[PDB]
Amino acid sequence: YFQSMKQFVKHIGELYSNNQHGFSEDFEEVQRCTADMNITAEHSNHPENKHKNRYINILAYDHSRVKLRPLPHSDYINANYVDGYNKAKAYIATQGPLKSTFEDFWRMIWEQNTGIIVMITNLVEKGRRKCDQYWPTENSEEYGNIIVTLKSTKIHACYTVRRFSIRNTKERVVIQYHYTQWPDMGVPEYALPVLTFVRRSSAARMPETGPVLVHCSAGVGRTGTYIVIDSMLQQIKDKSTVNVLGFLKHIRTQRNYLVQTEEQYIFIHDALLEAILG
Ligand SMILES: [Cl-]
Ligand SMILES: [Cl-]
Ligand SMILES: [Cl-]
Ligand SMILES: [Cl-]
């Protein structure tokens, strides 16, 4: 209803009050929940899989990890299923792929029936490598049994959309929504561009398709921020009634560190407030 929307908007101001005391309290709770819960990630730590992780301390929880079909530890990718508002396994949250995991990455896309990739990092930021370029600059590239062809590109102010066709050589359209303006440090000054990106990339999800693949560099901070904004917008649209903190605690059981920073937690609320007022 209008009334629960009114209470949420008021709750946002509450969190902001007293030098953001409520936001800090909320996020400290989130971090403590993560610290206290024991969630295994044995596969991520297996010696054979160590080179498949971009970061030694960003793992894939066992219970929610995406499994690749075994090949004649070939089942491992640093990726997890993550819920959306009502829908189980609405997303696959994953790291920016490495050259050594490009074949695995595209095979996962294929096997999962994924039609949309959401990328929320530049390849290099402030001279530091954040992600390897897992797609062809032009024409086609073969990544094991998957051939990926770049059909077309549209470069907007804050995001780029690349339309691919992929084919398993042992054809499907896959669209990449690539946000290109996230700052080197902190969060975006203005939420509106991110809101537009979330709305357009989320609207691209078609019926009877697999999870939307979301990644940044580690696949935790910006990735989690996207998933929470998208999911809470969908909840507001359908139900009203938002529960950002409970949703975040829940997804944090599915992939380590989703929404990594308090600044991101606050940004989520800025973005939802802008959506509500717009
Ligand atoms: Cl499992
Ligand atoms: Cl991986
Ligand atoms: Cl890296
Ligand atoms: Cl979505």
Residue numbers in the entry: 826 to 897, 903 to 1000, 1015 to 1122
Paper text:
Protein tyrosine phosphatases (PTPs) play a critical role in regulating cellular functions by selectively dephosphorylating their substrates. The ∼280 residue PTP catalytic domain consists of an α/β structure, and biochemical and structural studies have led to a detailed understanding of the catalytic mechanism (Barford et al., 1994; Zhang, 2002). Key features of the domain include the PTP signature motif, the mobile Trp-Pro-Asp “WPD” loop that in the closed conformation positions the conserved and catalytically important aspartate residue, and the phosphotyrosine recognition loop. Here we report the crystal structures of 22 PTP domains, including two tandem-domain RPTP structures and a detailed structural comparison of this protein family.
Also within this category are RPTPγ and RPTPβ, which have the secondary pocket with a basic residue albeit with bulky residues in the gateway region. The basic pocket is also found in the phosphatases RPTPγ and RPTPβ; however, the topology of the region differs in these phosphatases in that the gateway region is inaccessible. PTPs with particularly high enzymatic activity against generic substrates were RPTPσ and PTP subgroups R5, R3, NT1, NT2, NT3, NT4, and NT5. CD45 and members of subgroups R3 and R5 were extremely promiscuous and dephosphorylated most phosphopeptides with reasonable activity. All members of the R3 subgroup as well as RPTPγ were highly active, and it will be interesting to establish how this activity is regulated in vivo. Particularly notable within the RPTP group is the significantly different electrostatic potentials of CD45 and either LAR or RPTPγ.
